[PDB]
């Protein structure tokens, strides 16, 4: 007769939820994500091939998404609070023009205010250089941008704004299991499927319309989306080869410290030692049409095969999602894309200068929380960045039933796609080590 | 692609009797009832799930790409214009 | 307590530029999408446009691009906005109703709609 007996130990997992902890690399200073309590990582990962195994994934559902989106507005908001908060600089200023010579002219104020002294009994009158985003008129005689919804603070000297790769590592009793099937899209089941003990280098990298510095494809350019059918969903594109960018801010910045009380400091924006010159992006112009040549080959997969394609810029919103934001240096860009989608493919040396504008005061995670926004201080010296792009984020438009005709957009400011393309292959499951069996054997009583 | 059909072009049955509406289209697919210039109601969505508000007399399933409206036990005040509708896709709705 | 509120209606002539205005007090707007909607006298619906009350990036067919130009507003505390849709240049045939829907799920399920406003040329 056969008899049950009970095995500790089987390999049986379960979909589950739980709170993954954070894994730094090791340190040769600060910076606003808080990676000095992460634990170290193994100088080698064991990644354990599993054979015989079809394990089912599921994209636009993980939880692994959904808790890195709460880490990084709960580490963005939570440094923002101990030094100093500029509340009295909504004070009326008396703004004048820097360039002379009219074309752009009115892109840079010189505005002069009185700020208070050290001492709380005396003002002293002291001038700074602002941008045209960062002033509006009150009825010269400006003020700041908003001054009425919102406690603008410092963003904080001493932190960096330099993302470092992340690692998210599972509890005891958890595992995860990284899919390495190159045909595989963000919903189906992956038949050659891993396990690891945490992810590879994920960089928090906070952009709208391109996917700067991030993972890339293997061996054809990869699309991803929900679902093509419904126009509400962004349709995330990961490129195969990388395309290099150089941003850059020529205007050599000095900056000015302002005490504004008792040991507070302002630091404001002094002269500009040389000329008064634009931010701007450059792009490959050879290597722009070869990578868009390989998205409109693989976007006829899901739609009809002698279909016009076609490429628009955005269509409105606020600065964030009509133009390519990022964090080039510590400086916040906004460049305007209307190059790069401009174009129309019908079936069958030069770069492109992208001209951007640089904000100061910037409002993210919708006021984290109740109202707050940021002042990032003025950084000294040029800044020049160069940086891969590894994916768009476009926005196909509705109502296109006939001619065969589609139109893609860019678009964005959905901060969660940013890591959707990077949290796609991995899934944490739940081990349940108990199991059962028939057996010949016996209790020896 | 999104392909649309709607056969019942006019109906005028009478009160009490048991009436069927169709259309044929791919995917997700709501109804709703509008009557003569006000804004259009939604009565059931997905196929076959009822929405909270809109009396039990309304009931309707689907069966590979065939939609059905089940209308029982009419009322004097369930008179109106009826479509199926896809996202960005609605077809001019009959009337009773 | 979920209402979405309407504009009265509007006269114009043709080659003028009108606007009309929707506010949703009573529910969280910033995780539902606000479509607009507009039949002919005599026809169907026909579909508009899309915006995300988030963000602001606006939808448009090939039909009506260039003309429309979807803007939201939204207030202080963030409990109620202002949809707006102007229209840049209207024809003969824009004789027509205009509403205001509400995406509640993705199944594109418009539960709570305008009580519509009629303009003509």
């Known amino acids: 007769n056969l008899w049950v007996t009970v095995y500790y130990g089987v390999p049986v997992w379960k979909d589950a939820e739980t709170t993954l902890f954070c894994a730094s690399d090791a340190k040769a200073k600060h910076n606003v994500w808080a990676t000095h309590a992460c634990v170290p990582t193994d100088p080698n990962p064991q990644e354990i091939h599993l054979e015989n195994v079809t394990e089912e994934f599921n994209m636009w559902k993980n939880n692994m998404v959904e808790q890195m989106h709460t880490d990084i507005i709960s580490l963005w908001c939570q440094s923002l609070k101990p030094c100093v908060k500029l509340t009295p600089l909504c004070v009326t200023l008396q703004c004048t023009n820097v360039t002379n010579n009219i074309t752009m002219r009115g892109e840079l104020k010189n505005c002069s205010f009185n700020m208070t002294t050290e001492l709380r009994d005396k003002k002293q009158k002291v001038y700074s250089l602002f941008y045209r985003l960062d002033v509006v008129q009150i009825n010269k005689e400006y003020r700041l941008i908003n001054c009425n919804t919102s406690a603008i603070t410092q963003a904080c000297p001493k932190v960096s704004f330099e993302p470092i790769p992340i690692h998210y590592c599972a509890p005891a009793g958890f595992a995860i299991l990284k899919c390495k099937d190159k045909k595989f899209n963000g919903t189906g089941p992956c038949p050659n499927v891993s396990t690891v003990q945490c992810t590879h280098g994920i960089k928090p990298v906070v952009s709208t319309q391109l996917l700067l510095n991030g993972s890339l494809a293997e061996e054809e350019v990869m699309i991803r989306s929900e679902n093509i059918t419904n126009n509400a969903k962004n349709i995330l594109v990961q490129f195969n080869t990388p395309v290099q960018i150089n941003c850059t801010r020529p205007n050599n910045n000095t900056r000015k410290s302002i005490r504004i009380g008792p040991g507070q400091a302002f630091y404001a924006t002094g002269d500009i030692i040389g000329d008064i010159r634009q931010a701007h992006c450059n792009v490959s112009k050879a290597t722009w049409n070869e990578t868009l040549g390989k998205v409109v080959k693989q976007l006829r997969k899901h739609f009809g095969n002698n279909t016009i394609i076609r490429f628009a810029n955005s269509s409105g919103g606020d600065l964030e999602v009509t133009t390519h934001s990022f964090n080039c240096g510590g400086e916040f860009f906004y460049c305007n894309t209307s190059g790069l989608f401009n174009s129309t493919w019908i079936s069958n040396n030069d770069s492109i200068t992208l001209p951007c504008r640089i904000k100061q005061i910037i409002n993210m995670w919708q006021g984290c929380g109740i109202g707050q926004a940021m002042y990032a201080p003025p950084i000294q010296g040029v800044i020049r960045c160069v940086s891969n792009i590894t994916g768009l984020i476009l926005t196909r438009d509705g109502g296109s039933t006939n001619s065969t005709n589609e139109t893609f957009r860019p678009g964005g400011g959905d901060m969660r796609d940013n890591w959707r393309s990077e949290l796609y292959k991995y899934k944490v499951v739940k081990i349940e080590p108990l199991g059962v069996a028939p057996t010949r054997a016996k209790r020896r009583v | 692609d999104i392909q649309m059909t709607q056969s019942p072009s006019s109906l005028s049955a009478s009160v009490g009797d048991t009436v069927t509406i169709t259309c044929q289209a791919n995917g997700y697919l709501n109804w709703y009832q509008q009557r003569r210039g006000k804004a259009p109601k939604l009565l059931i969505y997905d196929g076959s799930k009822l929405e909270r508000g809109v009396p039990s007399r309304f009931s309707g399933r689907r069966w590979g790409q065939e939609y059905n409206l089940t209308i029982n036990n009419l009322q004097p005040e369930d008179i109106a214009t009826y479509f199926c509708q896809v996202y960005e896709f609605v077809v001019p709705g009959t009337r009773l | 307590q979920v209402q979405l509120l309407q504009s009265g209606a509007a006269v114009t002539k043709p080659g003028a530029s009108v606007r009309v205005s929707c506010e949703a007090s009573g529910y969280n707007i910033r995780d539902y999408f606000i479509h607009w909607w507009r039949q002919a006298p005599g026809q169907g619906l026909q579909w508009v446009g899309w915006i995300n009350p988030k963000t602001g990036q606006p939808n448009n067919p090939r039909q009506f691009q260039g003309r429309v130009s979807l803007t939201r507003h939204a207030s202080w505390d963030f409990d109620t906005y202002s949809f707006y849709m102007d229209l840049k240049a209207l024809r003969s045939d824009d004789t027509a109703v205009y509403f205001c829907?509400?995406?509640?799920?993705?199944?594109?399920?418009?539960?709570?709609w305008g009580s519509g406003t009629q303009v003509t040329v």
């Open positions: 829907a509400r995406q509640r799920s993705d199944y594109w399920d418009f539960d709570v």
